[PDB]
DNA sequence: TCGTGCTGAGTGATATCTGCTTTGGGTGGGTGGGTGGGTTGAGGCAAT
DNA sequence: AGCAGATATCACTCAGCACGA
């Protein structure tokens, strides 16, 4: 009736694999092999890597919406979004079972209450001078902190 | 070409509506005489209010009164349930 | 003067289709403004 | 994709008459 994610209260993160261990039972280990930014092309798109260089900017933490929780004036029930995008449209009819059949009109209005927020920070991650070829200028790699 | 929703004959006689009043509607008004005239009209009121709620949410209080009065007139089943209803008292 | 349709065209109303425009950046302009943003670098000028 | 204006097709109210009571 509500979204899994609505009740989770822990988050999952994937620690990279060690090169000891990938050398021990005769493994390349992608992950834990650091790159620099240049590095990082097209091609390592939706993979996990490891990014080698220095902290430039860190922004302050701010609450990112997750789950949205919506109220009726008129049904007396709960409704439920959710954002997994940028930007998204708040509801603005209610939708459910008895609105619908009644075909009474109802507003949904927005409850930060109940919703779900998960802490959120924007950092910058700059090459370092060792890593930048001859006559090159360094560049920088966006990096999103969510939870803990 | 949506039906629109009334407050139907079929509405009024179901479990939550006349027999909902019938069953319980002396127990939660009460008019007392130590009380304010204003307060026990909104008590009656609050009673006819929140079963009206109940029964068809569509439209306000008065408005529901107005709907009530015009189905009465025209409705035979509703006219036949009130009589009854009437008769039944009348025979205890 | 109540009840029950049959007629009815009027007075709605609400469920239902037809055209912008936008972000921002010169792949809309300077007869839309510079107090709605951009905007660091070079250049010429006056007071110094 | 979203929003504002508009068309047109959808019902509902007061209107009033025939039968009989
Ligand atoms: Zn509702």
Same mark, same amino acid.
């Given at each position: 009736?509500?979204? &899994?994610?609505?009740?989770?209260?822990?988050?999952?993160?994937?620690?990279?694999?060690?090169?000891?261990?990938?050398?021990?039972?005769?493994?390349?280990?992608?992950?834990?092999?650091?790159?620099? !930014?240049?590095?990082?092309? %097209?091609? +390592?798109?939706?993979?996990?890597?490891?990014?080698? %260089?220095?902290?430039?900017? !860190?922004?302050?933490?701010? &609450?990112? !919406?997750?789950?949205?929780?919506?109220? #009726?004036?008129?049904?007396?029930?709960?409704?439920?979004?959710?954002?997994?995008?940028?930007?998204?449209?708040?509801?603005?009819? #209610?939708?459910?079972?008895? #609105?619908? /059949?009644? /075909?009474?009109? %109802?507003?949904? +209005?927005?409850?930060?209450?109940?919703?779900?927020?998960?802490?959120? /920070?924007?950092?910058?991650?700059?090459?370092?001078?060792?890593?930048? &070829?001859?006559?090159?200028? &360094?560049?920088?790699?966006?990096?999103?902190?969510? %939870?803990? | 070409?949506?039906?629109?929703? @009334?407050? =139907?004959?079929?509405?009024? $006689?179901?479990?939550?509506?006349?027999?909902?009043? $019938?069953?319980?509607?002396?127990?939660?008004?009460?008019?007392?005489? @130590?009380?304010?005239?204003?307060?026990? $009209?909104?008590?009656?009121?609050?009673?006819?209010?929140?079963?009206?709620? *109940?029964?068809?949410? @569509?439209? @306000?209080?008065?408005?529901?009164?107005?709907?009530?009065? =015009?189905?009465?007139? =025209?409705?035979?089943?509703?006219? *036949?349930?009130?009589?009854? $209803?009437?008769?039944? *008292?009348?025979?205890?």
């Amino acid at each position: 009736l509500f979204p &899994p994610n609505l009740t989770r209260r822990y988050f999952l993160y994937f620690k990279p694999l060690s090169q000891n261990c990938a050398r021990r039972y005769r493994k390349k280990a992608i992950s834990s092999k650091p790159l620099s !930014v240049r590095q990082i092309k %097209g091609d +390592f798109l939706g993979q996990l890597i490891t990014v080698r %260089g220095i902290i430039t900017r !860190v922004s302050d933490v701010k &609450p990112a !919406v997750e789950v949205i929780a919506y109220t #009726c004036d008129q049904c007396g029930y709960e409704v439920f979004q959710e954002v997994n995008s940028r930007t998204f449209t708040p509801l603005s009819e #209610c939708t459910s079972e008895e #609105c619908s /059949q009644n /075909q009474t009109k %109802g507003q949904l +209005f927005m409850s930060t209450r109940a919703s779900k927020f998960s802490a959120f /920070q924007e950092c910058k991650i700059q090459e370092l001078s060792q890593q930048v &070829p001859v006559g090159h200028i &360094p560049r920088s790699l966006n990096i999103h902190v969510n %939870g803990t | 070409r949506r039906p629109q929703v @009334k407050l =139907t004959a079929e509405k009024l $006689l179901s479990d939550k509506g006349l027999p909902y009043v $019938l069953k319980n509607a002396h127990k939660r008004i009460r008019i007392s005489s @130590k009380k304010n005239s204003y307060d026990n $009209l909104s008590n009656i009121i609050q009673f006819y209010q929140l079963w009206a709620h *109940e029964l068809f949410p @569509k439209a @306000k209080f008065k408005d529901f009164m107005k709907i009530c009065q =015009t189905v009465g007139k =025209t409705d035979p089943v509703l006219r *036949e349930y009130r009589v009854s $209803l009437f008769r039944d *008292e009348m025979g205890m």
